[PDB]
Design a protein around this ligand. Structure first.
Ligand SMILES: Nc1nnc(-c2ccc(O)c(Cl)c2)c(-c2ccccc2)n1
Length: 291
């Protein structure tokens, strides 16, 4: 009952943390910029982890009996929250690039309305993708609980060809390659901005101070995304060994949960990465707690 205890411990922090983030954004209007509309989507997504994903994960770990639909939802619900984070992390990356690349058109393109629009779409695409195994791409009853009910075991009810090709490579690796590729242009151009401002016949510390603050936000966003791949790669790497190499000793359970717990930890680091990186956030929280 140790794994259970740890998972429960995470669920609490995941809720408290991201809920605090959502609250701080609703109180302080200085945090209600278009950029943080996506951060909220990240919060809500990372809240449902400690609310549903973790509860489901602890349940499916021991395995139960239920229909194919009910078994798939509980098993593929984490694929939804993890996919929604992909879009959110990608949007934030693009956003932080649009500001530095084109500061003028930034306010013209990046609107508070389009933000809510994109978010909605991302969630819809997240359910479509995350619950693709429910569309028929599953191993329900492939060569106990009785007719109708199926032994709900993640590896037995969820195809591996999906988890690898469709899910990992296409819906995770590719995005993380686009994101990384984005940050490549961001900092490459950001340093060019400083060079052009290094050969300017005027001080203009307003542009420098703003640029450095736009870069500080872009860097903070890079750290958030970096921790995502850092907490999910190990879990996918494990599945790449099992699939591509049937000979390769199937990953043990004590090592399996560690990669699963590692993924559940990602939802927790955000609230703390905001309080640390953003001086505006930490002070907002500090007020809420006291009062
Ligand atoms: N073999 C295997 N086993 N369990 C999970 C699993 C299940 C529920 C969860 O809540 C978490 Cl975090 C992980 C994954 C897995 C791997 C990559 C992406 C998503 C799931 N792969």
């Amino acid at each position: 009952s140790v794994y259970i205890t740890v998972e429960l411990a995470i669920a609490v922090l995941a809720i408290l943390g991201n809920v605090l983030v959502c609250w701080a954004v609703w109180l302080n209007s200085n945090l209600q910029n278009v950029t943080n509309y996506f951060v909220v989507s990240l919060a809500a997504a990372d809240i449902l982890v400690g609310v549903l994903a973790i509860p489901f994960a602890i349940t499916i770990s021991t395995g139960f009996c239920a229909a194919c639909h009910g078994c798939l939802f509980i098993a593929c619900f984490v694929l939804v929250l993890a996919q929604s984070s992909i879009f959110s992390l990608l949007a934030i990356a693009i956003d932080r690039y649009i500001a530095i690349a084109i500061p003028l058109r930034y306010n013209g393109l990046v609107t508070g309305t389009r933000a809510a629009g994109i978010i909605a779409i991302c969630w819809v695409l997240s359910f479509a993708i995350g619950l693709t195994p429910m569309l028929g791409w599953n191993n329900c009853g492939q060569p106990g609980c009785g007719e109708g009910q199926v032994a709900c075991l993640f590896e037995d009810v969820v195809p591996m060809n999906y988890m690898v090709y469709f899910n990992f490579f296409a819906c995770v690796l590719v995005p993380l390659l686009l994101m990384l590729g984005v940050y490549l242009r961001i900092f490459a151009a950001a340093r060019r901005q400083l060079k052009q401002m290094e050969s300017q016949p005027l001080p203009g510390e307003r542009a420098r101070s703003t640029l450095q603050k736009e870069v500080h936000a872009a860097k903070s966003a890079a750290i958030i995304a970096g921790l995502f791949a850092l907490c999910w790669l190990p879990l996918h790497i494990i599945n790449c060994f099992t699939f591509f190499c049937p000979d390769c000793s199937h990953a043990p359970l004590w090592l399996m949960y560690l990669a699963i717990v590692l993924a559940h930890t990602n939802s927790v680091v955000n609230p703390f990465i905001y309080a640390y990186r953003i001086r505006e956030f930490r002070q907002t929280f500090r007020k809420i707690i006291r009062s």
